[PDB]
Design a protein around this ligand. Structure first.
Ligand SMILES: Nc1ncnc2c1ncn2[C@H]1C[C@H](O)[C@@H](COP(=O)(O)CP(=O)(O)OP(=O)(O)O)O1
Ligand SMILES: [Mg+2]
Ligand SMILES: [Mg+2]
Ligand SMILES: [Mn+2]
Ligand SMILES: [Mn+2]
Ligand SMILES: [Mn+2]
Ligand code: NA
Ligand code: NA
Ligand code: NA
Length: 327
DNA sequence: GTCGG
DNA sequence: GCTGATGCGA
DNA sequence: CCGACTCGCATCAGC
């Protein structure tokens, strides 16, 4: 549906193969960087040489593009799709909690299908049992309309705990996406700063409240600053119950909000791009701060930030609306 | 797999 | 039973 | 040529 969708689809499938089967994370990132830069290219690619002009597209990817443009397919991908071990590992990783290591371990023991997981559920940990339970739901997209209803529940229940919590839905939702893969929530409270003593139960109070009104249905991981779990909109009068959804909550110091919003909003590739430019400009950006870089390349103190645009200003970038960060 | 060095 | 090692999602 | 490309949380192997 995009200018170079056939090429970027091929590159994404090759990326997932290198992550799930080969366990070569830098190849996975290399394919993703190539797909992202091609996705931003304003012309329809006619040759591998044309794509090779783009940063991140090298000899082999340009060669794969020429084959795909000539034959409409890739022999390398067709061999992968046919390899029983490769496609089995590739499938098992679609279960949340089953990564490349567990997928390879299961497949070696003849555990390679969904029904194999159900039959061998005793060998799954709690996370994997949940990922298997909601396997279909977790692959459904969340229409933005439903994200607004979820945002209403989250922000309202959070206010019910304490008036001074601030909850901001980030991720693809804040980037204006018509559909989202999950709900990502950033949480702050005046009592938690970078200079304050650990106030526990700050995130626990919010998670407990969302559980009490039956919004959060299951927990995958839960600590003092990060919650990973499952949520579900309420359904009306025995009508079609909603699909269960993944939700992430991150509690960050209030004085590092805007660096947190910038990171949590994404995209992941955009963050990689922005942080790469920051180093070319004498700064280093992470999830919490932007710091200067000295003559020796050492990181200074966190710089003052009171807006997302403040971070763009430091590295001398034109401000990008969250809508234009989906890279 | 790519690119800078 | 505890500690270090490792996998997981992001 | 070749080396570069973060963390909180859950679990469990190895004592
Ligand atoms: N591999 C990674 N490691 C660390 N941080 C990462 C990350 N990938 C993404 N992020 C950051 C930026 C995302 O906006 C934000 C959410 O990451 P995410 O997994 O929720 C993907 P998102 O951009 O929200 O779209 P969608 O598929 O859910 O509709 O977290
Ligand atoms: Mg042009
Ligand atoms: Mg249910
Ligand atoms: Mn079977
Ligand atoms: Mn998300
Ligand atoms: Mn998320
Ligand atoms: Na690699
Ligand atoms: Na190139
Ligand atoms: Na998985």
């Amino acid at each position: 549906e995009t200018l170079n969708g056939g090429i970027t689809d091929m590159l994404t499938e090759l990326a997932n193969f290198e992550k799930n089967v080969s366990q070569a994370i830098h190849k996975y990132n290399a394919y993703r960087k190539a797909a992202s830069v091609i996705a931003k290219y304003p012309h329809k690619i006619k040759s591998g040489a044309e794509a090779k002009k783009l940063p991140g597209v090298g000899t082999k990817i340009a060669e794969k593009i020429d084959e795909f443009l000539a034959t409409g397919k890739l022999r390398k991908l067709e061999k992968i799709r046919q390899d029983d071990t490769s496609s089995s590992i590739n499938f098992l990783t679609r279960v949340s909690g089953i990564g490349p290591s567990a997928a390879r371990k299961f497949v070696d023991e003849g555990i390679k299908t969904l029904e194999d997981l159900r039959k061998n559920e005793d060998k799954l940990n709690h996370h994997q049992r949940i990922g298997l339970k909601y396997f279909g739901d977790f692959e459904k997209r969340i229409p933005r309309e439903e994200m607004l209803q979820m945002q209403d529940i989250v922000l309202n229940e959070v206010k019910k705990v304490d008036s001074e919590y601030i909850a901001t839905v980030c991720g693809s939702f804040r980037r204006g996406a018509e559909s989202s893969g999950d709900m990502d929530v950033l949480l702050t409270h005046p009592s938690f700063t970078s200079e304050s003593t650990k106030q526990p139960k700050l995130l626990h109070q919010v998670v407990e409240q969302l559980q009490k009104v039956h919004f959060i249905t299951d927990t995958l991981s839960k600590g003092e600053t990060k919650f990973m779990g499952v949520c579900q909109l309420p359904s009306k009068n025995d009508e079609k119950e909603y699909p269960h959804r993944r939700i992430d909550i991150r509690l960050i110091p209030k004085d590092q909000y805007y660096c947190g919003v910038l990171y949590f909003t994404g995209s992941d590739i955009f963050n990689k791009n922005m942080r790469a430019h920051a180093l070319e400009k004498g700064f280093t950006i992470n999830e919490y701060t932007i710091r200067p870089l000295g003559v020796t390349g050492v990181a200074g103190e966190p710089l003052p930030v009171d807006s997302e645009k403040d971070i763009f200003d430091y590295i001398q970038w034109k401000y990008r609306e969250p809508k234009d960060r989906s890279e």
